[PDB]
C-alpha cells in the first residue's frame, strides 16, 4: 500500500489502518491538507502517528500517505542567517509565498532555496579516478563574508570520482560531483539529507581543553565552560535563562551559533531577528553582522506540541553538520523542560504507564542521548580537521523546585550547572547565578590554559570562593546573634564578600560597559578586590595585639575614596576605553590603595 | 549434546511498542529464549522472550525497535536461553554492553558457554570472608574495613567524585601485610569522559592486561544494560571459580541499570512498585549483588563494588534503599564534604561495613583497630552534635569539652579523611593517625576504649 486511512483522532495522535508495511519512525502525511507526522506504535495493520501540525477538522477515512523515510534535515548552503520552524520549513519564504502573517497547516516550502546561485570552487587536487570517502571536503562555497561553507561527501557515501564540476555559479539542484563504487554511479549536488534521530559520525572524540567565553564575570571566572561542553541553566520564571542564552549567543568565541526556541515566546525570536543584524563583530579591520554566523529554529509556546521534539533534533543535526566542517558550534536550547512536557502529552494519549510526575519512563534516556551529541572531535574525511559542539540547555522547573524530574535527570548528565535564584532576580541582582549551588566539572581541564595565558588567575579564583564561603558561614551567625560579636577579620570578610557580590558577580546586560566583560577586565577587577582584602586583613592582623590598633571602621573612614573607586571599576567601557586605559586605571587604583595602607 | 535441529524463522510480528516486539503463530514458545531480528534494510538486532502465552511471544529488543515493521522484519528463534562465550583470554580486551568486541580484536573463541544468569551456589558450600583488603584509603581501611569476598557499594550523587574513589581503589587495593586482583569493569550509561578516564588510568597504571571492560555509554541502547552486569559477573565467575583468580568487580551505575528496568516494566504495563520501578526490583538486584564471595575447596574469590547515584541525594529512594538490604554496608560520598574541597568526600556516619568485625584485630591487623574505630566514630558523631548546637548559641556558650570535640572534628577532616588521589596509607599509618587525633582528649573521655588498650597505645 502507498496510503492508509485515518481510523481515529484524539489531539495530536492519529490512528491509521491499511498501514501494514509501515516502519517505526517513518514520516507520513495525514489528511487532505497532507499534515506531516511520524509513526510511533504498530499493531496489526494499524499504525499510530504523532502529527506535527494541528489535527482540528481531520476526518475518519482521510488518506494517510506512507513515505519510505524518517524525519530528516536538508544540509547545504543557505542555512546561515535563516530561521526555520521545528520541521525545517523556512519562515521568511513562507511569509514571501503566502503574503500573510500566519503559517498554513500542511504548507510545503523547500528547506534550502533551489533558485539561489552559489559560487563553487572545487578542491584542486581531486581529479577523475580519485578515491573519496564520507566527510571528504571536495569544494567550498563562498556562502557569505563571515562563513565559508565547505562542501563534503555524505557519510555512508564513497567511491572513485567520475566527474567534478569546474569553478562557477551553481544551483542547489545542479550536480557538482559524480562517483562510482560497485560499478553503480552516484551523482551529488551541494545539498545532502540526514536523519535527525541519528548521530553524524566522527573519526574520534577528544578531551575538551579550551574555554567557551560568555563575557560574564561570574561564569567565566567562577563556573567555566569549554568548547565541546554540556551546560544546564535551571531557574524559576524571570531569572535570566533567556538573557544568558542571548548574551552567550551575541558575545562568544564560537564560529557558528544555532539557537533553538522550543515552547517559548514569539516576542523573543522577534527580539533576536531585530537585535542581531544591527550588532557586528570585527574581522580583518572590517565589521560583519553576527546574523551572518547564526541560524534560528522556532517552535513557539502556541505552535504544535509534538514539533518541540522536532526542533531539538533539527537543531543538534544542524550543529553537527557545521562541526563536520571543522567549526566550533554552540547550540542553545531555550527550554528543555518544554520538550519533556511534549513527551508527557504524547505518552498520556498513547495511554502509557508513567514515571515520576507523569513523565514517560524513557525521559532520562532521551535527555542523556541528546547531550551525548556534544563534544570536541576529529571530523570524518581526509583534510584532517577538528571541530566541536557545546550545548547549553535552559530548564524551567515548575514552582522553581530543582527536585523537578527534568532538572534532576539533567544534572545527572551535564558537566556545568548554573543554578539561578529568584531571590537574586527580585533584588535586580543579575546574572542571578547562585554561587553556593552552581558548579563546573571542567576546572581541572582549564589548568594548562590559565597556567599559560592568565598565570595569576587560579589563586584569585580560589580566594574568591573561600571569601564567599566564609561569608555564608558568618551570615547564619549574624542573622541570629546580631553582628556585634564579630572579629575585625570577620567584619573585613563580610565587607569584601559584599564588595564581590555587589561589584564583581553583578552585571547589567543592557548597558554599554557591562554588555560584555573581557577576561583581562575580569582578572584585573578580581585582582584588585583580592589585593584590598589581603592588605586590609594584614593591617588588622598585624596591629590587633597593640594598645593602638586598626579596625575595619578605621579602614572605612580612611579609605572611602578607594572603596568607592573599587565599586566603580565595573563602569569602565571595553570599547569606549582601551585595554591599555582600563589596565592602566586598575594599576593606578593599586598604587592609590597601597599609598593609603602605607599611610596606616 | 547440541541443538542440531534447524531454526524456525517467522514474519509474524503483530505489534511494536517501546522496546517490545510481539509475535504470534510461534511453535511451542520458550520463556527467556533468544531471538535474532533482521530488519528490511538487512540490519540485525537481538532480543529475549519476556512472556509466552499459547502461540504468542513478547520480545524485548536489546538494540531498540526503530525501523522495525509488521510485514518485512523477520525473527529467528534460536532454541536456547542466553549463554555467553567465556575464556581467560577475555583479560586485556574491551567489549560493549552486549559482549561484542570494540578493541578491533576478534570475537571470543570460547573455552565454554555459560548461562548469563549463573547457577545457585549452595549456602553449605560458601566460605565466610575474613581476609582484609587494604584499599589505601583511611576512611575505608580504618572505619569501614573491607573483607575479600564482600559486596560494598559506593553511594554517591551527581557532580560528586565517585569515579576517582573507585579508580583509586583499583590502583591501591591489595591484602594487609604484617597476590593481585583481576578487574572486571561494567559501565551502564556512562558519558564518554568517564569511559576515557577509567580506560586511560588502566593503560597509565600499566595493568590493562589484567582487566576486562564491558562498556555501554549514554548514547548506546538502554536495554543492553539489562544484560551488561550479568555478562560481567558471568566472566568473573569463570575466572574466580574455574581459573582460581581473585576478582574485583566494578558496576559503575546501578541507577542507570534500575532506570532501564523501569523502561521495560512500564512498556509491559505491569503493576508498579515505589517511584514507578518494578515490583520485583529487590529480587532482580539480589541476582546481581549475591554473585560474589568464596566457595569450598576453590582458591579464588569475587569482591563486588557497585556504584550508585542517588537522585536528589536521597538514601530513602528505592535504588539505594533496596541495595542496603542486600549489600554488606555502604561507602557514602557527601556533597557537604565535596563543597568544602575535602577529598575523599566520604561521610563516615552513614557509611558501614558489615564484615569488618571479623576481618580486623590481633593477627588480622592490630589489636587496637576496633577500639580506635569505635572511639573515632563516637567523637565525630558528638562533634557534629556540638557543631549543630554552636551554630545557634555561638562559641561563648560552649564548655572546654565542647571545644575539644570541635577541635577534633576539624583535625579529623583535615588529617584522617583528607588524603589525595595517589597517597596510599597502610592500615598501620591509618591507625596511628587515629591515635594522633585521640590524643586531643584526656583518657577519661575515651570511654569506648578498654583500659588495657589505653595503657598500651595512648602514651606513645
Amino acid at each position: 500500500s502507498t496510503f492508509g486511512y485515518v481510523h481515529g483522532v484524539s489531539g495530536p495522535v492519529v490512528t491509521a489502518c491499511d498501514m501494514a508495511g509501515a516502519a517505526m519512525y517513518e514520516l507520513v502525511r495525514v489528511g487532505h491538507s497532507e499534515l506531516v507526522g511520524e509513526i510511533i506504535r504498530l499493531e496489526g495493520d494499524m499504525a499510530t502517528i504523532q502529527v506535527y501540525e494541528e489535527t482540528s477538522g481531520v476526518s475518519v477515512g482521510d488518506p494517510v500517505l506512507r513515505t519510505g523515510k524518517p524525519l530528516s534535515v536538508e544540509l547545504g548552503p543557505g542555512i546561515m542567517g535563516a530561521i526555520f520552524d521545528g520541521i525545517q520549513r523556512p519562515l521568511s519564504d513562507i511569509s514571501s509565498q503566502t503574503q500573510s502573517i500566519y503559517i498554513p497547516r500542511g504548507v510545503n516550502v523547500s528547506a534550502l532555496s533551489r533558485d539561489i546561485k552559489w559560487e563553487f570552487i572545487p578542491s584542486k587536487n581531486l581529479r577523475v579516478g580519485s578515491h573519496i570517502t564520507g566527510g571528504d571536503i571536495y569544494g567550498i562555497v563562498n556562502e557569505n563574508s563571515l562563513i565559508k561553507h565547505k562542501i563534503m561527501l555524505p557519510p555512508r557515501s564513497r567511491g572513485s570520482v567520475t566527474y567534478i564540476a569546474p569553478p562557477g555559479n551553481y544551483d542547489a539542484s545542479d550536480v557538482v560531483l559524480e562517483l562510482e563504487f560497485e560499478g553503480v554511479k552516484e551523482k551529488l549536488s551541494m545539498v545532502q539529507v540526514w536523519p535527525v534521530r541519528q548521530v553524524r559520525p566522527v573519526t574520534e572524540k577528544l578531551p575538551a581543553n579550551h574555554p567557551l567565553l560568555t563575557g560574564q564575570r561570574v561564569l567565566d571566572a567562577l563556573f567555566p565552560c569549554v568548547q565541546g561542553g554540556t551546560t544546564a541553566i535551571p531557574g524559576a520564571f524571570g531569572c535570566g535563562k533567556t538573557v544568558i542564552s542571548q548574551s552567550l549567543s551575541k558575545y562568544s568565541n564560537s564560529d557558528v551559533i544555532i539557537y533553538v526556541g522550543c515552547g517559548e515566546r514569539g516576542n523573543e525570536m522577534s527580539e533576536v531577528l531585530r537585535d542581531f543584524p544591527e550588532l557586528t563583530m570585527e574581522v580583518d579591520g572590517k565589521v560583519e553582522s553576527i546574523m551572518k554566523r547564526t541560524a534560528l529554529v522556532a517552535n513557539t509556546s502556541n505552535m504544535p506540541v509534538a514539533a518541540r521534539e522536532a526542533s531539538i533534533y533539527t537543531g543538534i543535526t544542524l550543529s553537527e553538520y557545521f562541526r563536520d566542517m571543522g567549526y566550533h558550534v554552540s547550540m542553545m536550547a531555550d527550554s528543555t523542560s518544554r520538550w519533556a512536557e511534549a513527551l508527557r502529552e504524547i505518552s498520556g494519549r498513547l495511554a502509557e504507564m508513567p514515571a515520576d510526575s507523569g513523565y514517560p519512563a524513557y525521559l532520562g534516556a532521551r535527555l542523556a542521548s541528546f547531550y551525548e551529541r556534544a563534544g570536541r572531535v576529529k571530523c570524518l574525511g581526509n583534510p584532517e580537521r577538528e571541530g566541536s559542539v557545546s550545548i547549553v540547555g535552559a530548564v524551567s522547573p515548575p514552582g522553581g523546585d530543582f527536585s523537578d524530574p527534568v532538572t534532576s535527570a539533567t544534572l545527572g548528565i551535564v558537566q556545568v550547572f548554573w543554578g539561578l535564584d529568584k531571590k537574586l532576580a527580585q533584588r535586580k541582582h543579575f546574572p542571578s547565578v547562585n554561587w553556593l549551588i552552581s558548579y563546573s566539572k571542567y576546572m581541572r581541564a582549564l589548568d594548562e590554559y590559565y597556567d599559560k595565558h592568565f598565570t595569576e588567575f587560579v589563586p584569585l579564583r580560589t580566594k574568591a570562593k573561600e571569601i564567599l564561603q566564609e561569608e555564608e558561614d558568618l551570615a547564619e551567625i549574624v542573622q541570629l546573634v546580631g553582628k556585634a560579636s564579630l572579629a575585625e577579620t570577620d567584619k573585613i570578610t563580610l565587607e569584601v564578600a559584599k564588595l564581590i557580590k555587589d561589584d564583581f558577580l553583578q552585571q547589567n546586560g543592557y548597558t554599554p560597559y557591562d554588555r560584555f566583560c573581557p577576561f583581562y577586565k575580569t582578572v584585573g577587577m578580581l585582582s584588585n578586590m583580592i589585593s584590598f582584602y589581603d592588605m586590609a586583613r594584614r593591617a588588622v592582623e598585624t596591629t590587633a595585639q597593640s594598645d593602638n590598633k586598626i579596625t575595619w571602621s578605621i579602614i572605612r573612614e580612611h579609605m572611602g575614596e578607594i572603596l568607592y573607586k573599587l565599586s566603580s571599576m565595573k563602569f569602565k567601557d571595553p570599547v569606549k576605553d582601551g585595554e591599555a586605559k582600563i589596565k592602566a586605571d586598575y594599576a593606578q587604583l593599586l598604587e592609590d590603595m597601597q599609598n593609603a595602607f602605607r599611610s596606616l | 549434546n547440541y541443538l542440531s535441529q534447524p531454526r524456525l524463522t517467522y514474519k509474524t510480528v503483530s505489534g511494536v511498542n517501546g522496546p517490545l516486539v510481539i509475535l504470534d503463530h510461534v511453535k511451542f514458545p520458550r520463556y527467556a529464549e533468544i531471538v535474532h531480528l533482521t530488519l528490511p534494510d538487512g540490519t540485525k538486532r537481538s532480543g529475549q522472550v519476556l512472556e509466552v502465552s499459547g502461540s504468542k511471544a513478547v520480545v524485548q529488543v536489546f538494540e531498540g525497535t526503530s525501523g522495525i515493521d509488521a510485514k518485512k522484519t523477520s525473527c529467528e528463534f534460536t532454541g536456547d536461553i542466553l549463554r555467553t562465550p567465556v575464556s581467560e583470554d577475555m583479560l586485556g580486551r574491551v567489549f560493549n554492553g552486549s559482549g561484542k568486541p570494540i578493541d578491533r580484536g576478534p570475537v571470543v573463541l570460547a573455552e565454554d558457554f555459560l548461562d548469563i544468569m549463573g547457577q545457585p551456589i549452595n549456602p553449605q558450600c560458601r566460605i565466610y570472608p575474613e581476609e582484609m583488603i587494604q584499599t589505601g584509603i583511611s576512611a575505608i581501611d580504618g572505619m569501614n574495613s573491607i573483607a575479600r569476598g564482600q559486596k560494598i557499594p559506593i553511594f554517591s550523587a551527581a557532580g560528586l567524585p565517585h569515579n576517582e574513589i573507585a579508580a583509586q581503589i583499583c590502583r591501591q587495593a591489595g591484602l594487609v601485610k604484617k597476590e593481585n586482583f583481576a578487574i572486571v569493569f561494567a559501565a551502564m550509561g556512562v558519558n564518554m569522559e568517564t569511559a576515557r578516564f577509567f580506560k586511560s588510568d588502566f593503560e597509565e597504571n600499566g595493568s590493562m592486561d589484567n582487566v576486562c571492560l564491558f562498556l555501554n555509554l549514554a548514547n548506546d541502547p538502554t536495554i543492553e544494560r539489562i544484560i551488561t552486569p550479568r555478562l560481567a559477573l558471568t566472566t568473573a565467575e569463570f575466572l574466580a571459580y574455574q581459573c582460581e583468580k581473585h576478582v574485583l568487580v566494578i558496576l559503575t551505575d546501578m541507577s542507570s541499570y534500575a532506570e532501564a528496568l523501569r523502561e521495560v516494566s512500564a512498556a509491559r504495563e505491569e503493576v508498579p512498585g515505589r517511584r514507578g520501578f518494578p515490583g520485583y526490583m529487590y529480587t532482580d538486584l539480589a541476582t546481581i549483588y549475591e554473585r560474589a564471595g568464596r566457595v569450598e575447596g576453590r582458591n579464588g574469590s569475587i569482591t563486588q563494588i557497585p556504584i550508585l547515584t542517588m537522585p536528589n541525594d536521597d538514601i530513602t529512594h528505592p535504588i539505594p534503599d533496596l541495595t542496603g538490604y542486600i549489600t554488606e554496608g555502604q561507602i557514602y560520598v557527601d556533597r557537604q564534604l565535596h563543597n568544602r574541597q575535602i577529598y575523599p568526600p566520604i561521610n563516615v556516619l552513614p557509611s558501614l561495613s558489615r564484615l569488618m568485625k571479623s576481618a580486623i584485630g590481633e593477627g588480622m591487623t592490630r589489636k587496637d583497630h576496633a577500639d580506635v574505630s569505635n572511639q573515632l566514630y563516637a567523637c565525630y558523631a558528638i562533634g557534629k552534635d556540638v557543631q549543630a548546637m554552636k551554630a545557634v548559641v555561638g562559641e561563648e556558650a560552649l564548655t572546654s569539652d565542647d571545644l575539644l570535640y570541635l577541635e577534633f572534628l576539624q583535625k579529623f577532616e583535615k588529617n584522617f579523611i583528607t588524603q589525595g588521589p595517589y597517597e596510599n596509607r597502610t592500615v598501620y599509618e591509618t591507625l596511628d593517625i587515629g591515635w594522633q587525633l585521640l590524643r586531643i582528649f584526656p583518657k577519661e573521655m575515651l570511654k569506648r576504649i578498654p583500659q588495657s588498650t589505653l595503657s598500651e597505645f595512648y602514651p606513645r
Binding site: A351, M353, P354, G358 | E269
Partner: peptide
C-alpha cells in the same frame, strides 16, 4: 492513584476481550 486507575481500565479491556472470545467460541 492515577497509576492504580489505568490498571483497572486495562484489566476491564482484557475481561471484555475474553468475553468477546467466549462469544466467538
Amino acid at each position: 492513584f492515577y497509576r492504580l486507575k489505568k490498571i483497572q481500565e486495562k484489566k476491564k479491556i482484557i475481561k471484555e476481550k475474553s468475553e468477546k472470545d467466549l462469544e466467538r467460541r
